[PDB]
Design a protein around this ligand. Structure first.
Ligand SMILES: *[C@@H]1O[C@H](CO)[C@@H](O)[C@H](O)[C@H]1NC(C)=O
Ligand SMILES: *[C@H]1O[C@H](CO)[C@@H](O)[C@H](O)[C@@H]1O
Ligand SMILES: *[C@H]1O[C@H](CO)[C@@H](O)[C@H](O)[C@@H]1O
Ligand SMILES: *[C@H]1O[C@H](CO)[C@@H](O)[C@H](O)[C@@H]1O
Ligand SMILES: *[C@H]1O[C@H](CO)[C@@H](O)[C@H](O)[C@@H]1O
Ligand SMILES: *[C@H]1O[C@H](CO)[C@@H](O)[C@H](O)[C@@H]1O
Ligand SMILES: *[C@H]1O[C@H](CO)[C@@H](O)[C@H](O)[C@@H]1O
Ligand SMILES: *[C@H]1O[C@H](CO)[C@@H](O)[C@H](O)[C@@H]1O
Ligand SMILES: [Ca+2]
Ligand SMILES: [Ca+2]
Ligand SMILES: [Ca+2]
Ligand SMILES: [Ca+2]
Ligand SMILES: [Ca+2]
Ligand SMILES: [Ca+2]
Ligand SMILES: [Ca+2]
Ligand SMILES: [Ca+2]
Ligand SMILES: [Ca+2]
Ligand SMILES: [Ca+2]
Ligand SMILES: [Ca+2]
Ligand SMILES: [Ca+2]
Ligand SMILES: [Ca+2]
Ligand SMILES: [Ca+2]
Ligand SMILES: [Ca+2]
Ligand SMILES: [Ca+2]
Ligand SMILES: [Ca+2]
Ligand SMILES: [Ca+2]
Lengths: 409, 409
């Protein structure tokens, strides 16, 4: 079988080979014996003047050999009187007329933010119908910090790219990445096909809901009626959607007796009345946690302001029913103490007597006062005496309590 | 004012201090002068024999002083004939009888696996009713690789512990962590209160569903009836529950026209019949993605096996209807070739004549046959001839086509 090697995509009329000269026939025999050439799906023309094989149709190697590495066509030469048949093998060389191209212009991707480094994603394969060196050679990707491109060859023999993640993604810093991907063949000069991949990072629950303040400080008067909304907590979750829906809760145990907390709204209200004498300061550990159990905690301290709601109490320690009227000057008559549960200015007290009696007030020790008689009296002058002592605290509103004592001579 | 310092929680009858020895009163004067002691709602007893100050009630510093940093009680001593009043101050020393303790014995915690390192979680504060050095001193945590303990102070002055995570958690490696937290006061000897921290690691979607094989390869004959389950993909997600429910989908484009994939069962089935002459091999990129966007991809490769389903067709290239009666032996009369779309042994063919005709077969090359006449015949014997050529295929089951041609002399 005579063999003729020609490249594909040759213009009509180009010469394949001297078929008549190779067969040993002359122009006279080519004209006399009807010379025809027959292929499977191709047609060739032979002119009577030259007697050589000329191309009659456009030959696309990728159409006929369709990925066969070595390409050949089986032609037949028919002659008449006497009719005879001959076989010609024509090897078709590939030309780099087809550039690599992607199935889609843009590739849209979704990569989870929680994707571990080193993870790989398979990308769309670039197709190059050419074979051999003119086929697809390598892939290259635009430079970036996150993705490094790998070229793997699938079982058929083609080349497909996959992405190896170098660093963990973070949509809270960069939501999406737009990259340019190129595929180059091994030609001279080589050809490039480009697709622009648009990667979208979906939210991953990797950010905890953080409060606006690490510590919240409020001040309240103890006369605050229960049910009042004392505070509204502010917190934000840098994530998105499910990963950003959080609730507030009382981390402290048994401390919900004095305060109530709406978990969704994050506001703290008073369950019951506050008493400065009972609890002066509150410390509440409040937590914010999303549906993914990511939580951050902060402390809310509450300062209760003292109000003058407790009247001062007089407690007579001891008293002498019978005393002498002609007793010496400054004679002690009764011993009593003044106690007030309040604190600060609400605890300071001032007490006074009537003044008509000869008795006078004196200060001996803290929270204790002695009632004495500065001037002696006659039993005939005044046998019995009633005295009303008033103890008033000056913090607003000032409050006073009185105690009436009877002394006999 | 005489001052006597005694620790709290001393048994009744214990001596506070020799008040008479400091005052210099005599035993006879102790009996004569009624010596009385009066405190704020507290009672102390003095026996006439010794003449010293003895306790009559139990003294609990935390109950009466309720957290005062320095606590003292003001008692009063009364004598008769001559009646006198004196002031005595009793400083109550604190005793380390209350150990620090947490509000709850066990603390149950939920920490997301995706919690970043260095994150801190505030824990419940330990309360110590003692005041001063005997109060709470420091916190310490059981040793482990994951959590490091920090001691921080809230505005009131108390001490609360918070946990700083040293290394990333992993529920797929360790589901839960059980730790012991202790709070120690500054006493001699010091006392410890313990709370049991039970940390449970909540699942985070940090594992992508991985296939049982990176590439799946199956081989199929083209006569495979559609609807046949060609493959069943196997993949697992190491996460838990929602984060582990994934589906399979055809990531490859336009290749779903010939194949269908049940996502729940993970089944790959054939939509339509396969043809070896059309497509020899299929390559489909299939993806598996959970309820998040964590996805893994794998390649499925299908090799189509050629079956003898196309019968060979005989095509007569050329023929001379009229031939000379005096034609010699071996005179060529017809040219024909056999075409079979199949490949391999399914493409090899064998042709035969009727046998009634005198003609014989010759081969010009493979799949091309020349019909000649081996023995000369007389025109008067047989003018015309019908000959039916049979072409049989060698692939099992063999397929044959016949073609009848007529020759006239
Ligand atoms: C054989 O050829 C003759 C004419 O030469 C024709 O009449 C006859 O029908 C043919 N045989 C068959 C089976 O048709
Ligand atoms: C794509 O890139 C290649 C080099 O890799 C060029 O040769 C080609 O022309 C196209 O610009
Ligand atoms: C692919 O496409 C890019 C533009 O998107 C070109 O710059 C490149 O040379 C190749 O043709
Ligand atoms: C503040 O918010 C509470 C609900 O948390 C209300 O009950 C209150 O009346 C105020 O609006
Ligand atoms: C708890 O631990 C402390 C030391 O950390 C001891 O001093 C205490 O008595 C208790 O055992
Ligand atoms: C609390 O309890 C633990 C045992 O559960 C002790 O080891 C610790 O010293 C503290 O007394
Ligand atoms: C394989 O599995 C598929 C599941 O749809 C079936 O339809 C088929 O018949 C074979 O059992
Ligand atoms: C050729 O042979 C096949 C059997 O292989 C027949 O079915 C056909 O009719 C022809 O005779
Ligand atoms: Ca071409
Ligand atoms: Ca080409
Ligand atoms: Ca090319
Ligand atoms: Ca993030
Ligand atoms: Ca996020
Ligand atoms: Ca979150
Ligand atoms: Ca009050
Ligand atoms: Ca008050
Ligand atoms: Ca008051
Ligand atoms: Ca005690
Ligand atoms: Ca104590
Ligand atoms: Ca203690
Ligand atoms: Ca994990
Ligand atoms: Ca996990
Ligand atoms: Ca998962
Ligand atoms: Ca077929
Ligand atoms: Ca066949
Ligand atoms: Ca076939």
């Amino acid at each position: 079988p005579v063999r003729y090697s020609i490249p594909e995509e040759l213009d009509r009329g180009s010469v394949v080979g001297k078929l008549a000269k190779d067969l040993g026939l002359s122009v006279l025999e080519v004209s006399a014996r009807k010379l025809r050439v027959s292929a499977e799906k191709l047609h060739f023309s032979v002119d009577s003047e030259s007697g050589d094989l000329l191309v009659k149709d456009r030959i696309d190697r990728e159409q006929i050999c369709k990925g066969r590495r070595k390409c050949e066509l089986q032609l037949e030469a028919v002659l008449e009187n006497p009719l005879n048949i001959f076989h010609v093998v024509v090897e078709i060389e590939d030309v780099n007329d087809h550039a690599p191209q992607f199935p889609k212009d843009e590739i849209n991707l979704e990569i989870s933010e929680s994707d571990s480094p080193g993870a790989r994603t398979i990308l769309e394969s670039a197709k190059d119908l050419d074979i051999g060196m003119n086929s697809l050679s390598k892939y290259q990707l635009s430079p970036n910090d996150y993705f490094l491109l790998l070229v793997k060859d699938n079982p058929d023999g083609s080349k497909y790219p996959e992405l190896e993640l170098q660093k963990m993604l973070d949509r809270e810093a960069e939501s999406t990445h737009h990259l340019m991907l190129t595929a180059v063949d091994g030609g001279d000069p080589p050809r490039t096909g480009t697709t622009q991949l648009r990667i979208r990072v979906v939210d991953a629950n990797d950010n905890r809901p953080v409060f606006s303040q690490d510590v919240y400080r409020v001040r309240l008067p103890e006369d605050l009626p229960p049910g009042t909304t004392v505070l509204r907590l502010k917190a934000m979750d840098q994530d998105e959607g499910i990963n950003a829906e959080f609730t507030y809760s009382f981390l402290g145990v048994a401390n919900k007796a004095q305060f109530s907390l709406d978990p969704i709204t994050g506001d703290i209200v008073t369950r019951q009345s506050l008493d400065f004498e009972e609890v002066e300061q509150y410390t509440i550990d409040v937590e914010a946690k999303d549906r993914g159990s990511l939580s951050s905690q902060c402390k809310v301290i509450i300062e209760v302001l003292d109000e003058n709601d407790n009247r001062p109490e007089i407690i007579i320690t001891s008293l002498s029913d019978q005393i002498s009227e002609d007793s010496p000057s400054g004679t002690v008559v009764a011993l009593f103490k003044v106690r007030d549960r309040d604190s600060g200015e609400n605890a300071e007290v001032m007490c006074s007597l009537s003044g008509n009696n000869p008795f006078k007030i004196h200060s001996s020790s803290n929270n204790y006062y002695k009632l004495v008689t500065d001037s002696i009296l006659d039993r005939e002058q005044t046998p019995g005496y009633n005295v009303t002592i008033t103890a008033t605290d000056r913090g607003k509103p000032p409050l006073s309590s009185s105690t009436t004592i009877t002394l006999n001579v």
